[PDB]
Amino acid sequence: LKTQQEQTQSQLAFLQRKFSNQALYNWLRGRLAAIYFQFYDLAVARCLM
């Protein structure tokens, strides 16, 4: 069981420093959402033209 704890914590540590983070997707979605709003306004401007 002690080993198992060190197992799980180890996996958890992975979740921390694996390249695909919680943070990575947070910034990724944040930025892409901002750019998506701005780009919607520009494309609806086109459609209105």
């Binding site: 947070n26 930025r31 901002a34």
Partner: protein
């Protein structure tokens, strides 16, 4: 003080948080240091807001998703709420605003350079402060819109009305108990909180929410109004103010505990020894209460 320590200790033990976990949230220390995480926020808000016009849109609103990108798992509405709270609290050795903040970003900041203006320290604080408030939303687990109501109008949660929303152990546990109350309402919760936004929320409606008899709630509000409280309870604010709701609810819990109507609770509290120094209660009155 003893009452306060007892209450908060019992509450932390109840909810499995050490004192330290609470300190990092309640307190206004804010260690100033340039962490990689903060550097990343500053970068995302810098390149994000490169072109901003005070006229076209609100600063906070344009800014919201950008800081939400840096903090772990927070939505946009969450981020905005955090910013309103930030600007209300002014967290720094130098009082901070999203405006002062943005001023410093656009003015004196340069990405990927270690050296920077010492003013950064005040600003660094601001950042960790945002993260702090973020935790409060997640930690207490309040409804997102509700959290926004809290920061926008802390007044309805019994605040001074002239003050920034409270960042206290007392107010944090309030937030928790409110969240838990909403969850107790369950499916009806949206209807309830919505009604609480306007003066729409009434007894008989909260009654339909908590599966209690409407008359129980109505009698409870009456009885709360009749007796004097530290925050008084009046027909106008019985269900607009959370504090009045918590009070009236407490009347319900006591009454349901003694298996009696609020009517009985009034007689019981009437039997107070110092209060009845003025009109001494009948023996027969005591018999009535006993019955």
């Amino acid at each position: 003080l003893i009452r306060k320590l007892n209450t908060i200790t019992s509450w932390l033990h109840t909810q499995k948080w050490s004192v330290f976990q609470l300190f990092i949230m309640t307190s206004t220390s804010y260690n100033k240091t340039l962490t990689p995480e903060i550097k990343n926020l500053l970068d995302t808000v810098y390149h994000g807001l490169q072109g901003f016009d005070k006229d076209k849109a609100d600063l906070l609103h344009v800014m919201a998703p950008y800081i939400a990108a840096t903090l772990q798992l927070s939505s946009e509405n969450v981020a905005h709420s955090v910013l309103l709270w930030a600007d209300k609290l002014q967290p720094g050795d130098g009082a901070m605003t999203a405006e002062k903040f943005w001023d410093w970003l656009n003015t004196k900041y340069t990405p990927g350079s270690s050296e920077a203006v010492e003013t950064q320290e005040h600003i660094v604080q601001y950042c960790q402060a945002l993260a702090q408030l973020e935790m409060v939303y997640h930690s207490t687990g309040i409804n997102e819109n509700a959290f926004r109501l809290f920061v926008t109008k802390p007044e309805m949660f019994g605040a001074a009305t002239g003050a920034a929303p409270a960042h206290d152990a007392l107010s944090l546990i309030m937030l928790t108990r409110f969240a838990d109350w909403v969850n107790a309402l369950g499916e009806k919760a949206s209807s309830v909180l919505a009604a609480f936004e306007a003066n729409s929320l009434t007894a008989e409606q909260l009654a339909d929410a908590m599966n209690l008899d409407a008359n129980l709630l109505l009698q409870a509000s009456i009885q709360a109004q009749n007796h004097q409280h530290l925050p008084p309870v009046t027909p106008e604010n019985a269900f607009s103010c959370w504090t009045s709701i918590n009070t009236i609810l407490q009347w319900v819990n006591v009454a349901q505990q003694l298996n009696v109507a609020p009517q009985g609770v009034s007689a019981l509290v009437g039997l107070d020894y110092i209060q009845s120094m003025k009109e001494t209660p009948t023996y027969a009155q005591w018999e009535n209460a006993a019955g």
